[model samples]
Target: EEVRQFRRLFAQLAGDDMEVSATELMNILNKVVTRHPDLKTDGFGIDTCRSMVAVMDSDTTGKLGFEEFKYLWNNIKRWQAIYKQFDTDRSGTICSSELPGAFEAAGFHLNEHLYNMIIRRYSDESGNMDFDNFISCLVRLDAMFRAFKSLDKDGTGQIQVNIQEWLQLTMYS
Candidate 1:
């Protein structure tokens, strides 16, 4: 029954071609995520939609088939689960003040400057992190941490390289 419902929705969004362009997917995502009134209170923006496009467009074809669309939908569901875990207040937004705790929970121990930078980068006009931007923020921060860890070859969590090597790492990474 659920699969039938999704098939109907997929057909409605993609039509007989079984494919949707980026703009169409964006609009579909904007509407579908918001349609669940009880679950998704804070809707996503165009930036989030674009991020989804980049994630699911494996062939860079500017269109997505059912498998790609399903992949993106699952990712959104995963992000929503993480958002719910972090957004303890249930206020439909993550407070800037509580960002540190959220980051800690996500295994990122950011210092004061990095924490402030994240807040400045991801916060909305009301100084709160919305669901869409928060998902992007987490994705970017995770990549950054992974890159740094890769640079830190030793188990000591520190790298001992010459100044030139440092410059090379900084320049490339």
Candidate 2:
């Protein structure tokens, strides 16, 4: 029913191969946000889109198929929880100014530059955060946390590796 239209949109966006690139996903998301500003909380950025593609591209082909898309779409409730937590004002959209505190509440201490970058990534032209953008950020954050957990295989909650190893882990994984 609803999912059929979902696949149709993705299939149209993906063209002949029925596979959607990260950029294509972002473009679609941006258009969706633009068309429904009241739904501003559902926007996404490039990095988050890339992370999602990375997770959903089961074949590692850097694109998404119907199964992967369906799996990710089914997780909407999980993302909505995080979105609700950060939408403190209950204004249906989060402001850029509130992002830092929201991240802090989530236990991530981001520096000024990174915080600004995050805001730029997910915030609309009016500098408001949407649920879609929050979900994208959450996906990337979850990916990072998973990578860190893998690095800390012993579950020590910390890892002590050489500088080169750290750089490789952060850059490639």
Candidate 3:
């Protein structure tokens, strides 16, 4: 499903005035999926990826809505940037051990002291973060998806956000 989403995202990016090409999109996807290996597994093949694109078209116009494609574009960039900075062991995913140091290495304005403080706040005494907690920390801290869910309105469906929300969420960090 994610791969399909990636193809759709890539197609939208390609169609943009930026002229993102298939090869470029594939390259980006490879990097992203390699780090987030769940995306490359079975039951998540090419056809599934295509449908993910179709859904993005929303009105069936064969193109992405501005917010939708924009989110996808940013997502590709975000994952790529993170992957390059982290994965110190050159292993695929950002496992528990590597997260804190990797995050600091990414230059998120954290000195070692502040980075360790932040990590201890969010991680267990053993230094492992549960997946949901980690993702929520990113969301609540408005690190990545502030734009992606800017208009959620506390609903069960599509969510959304704004700059103020971003500030509010990140204030603790």
lDDT of 1 by residue, 8-48 (tens): 87788987667876567768656755765534335555665
Alpha-carbon error at 60 in model 3, in Å?
24
lDDT of 3 by residue, 37-120 (tens): 432222223433343334333354544455555564564356445644565655434456677655554344445776576567
**Clashes (N, CA, C under 3 Å) per candidate:** 0, 8, 9
Clashing pairs in 1: none
Q: Candidate 1 at 131: error in angstroms?
A: 2.4
Model 1 whole-model lDDT (C-alpha atoms): 0.67
> Candidate 2: lDDT over CA atoms?
0.70
Q: How far off is model 1, as Cα RMSD?
A: 6.2
- Candidate 3's C-alpha runs over 4 A off are 1-65, 90-101, 104-107, 111-114, 129-173
TM-score of each: 0.59, 0.55, 0.33
lDDT against the true structure, per candidate, is 0.67, 0.70, 0.48
RMSD of 3: 11.5
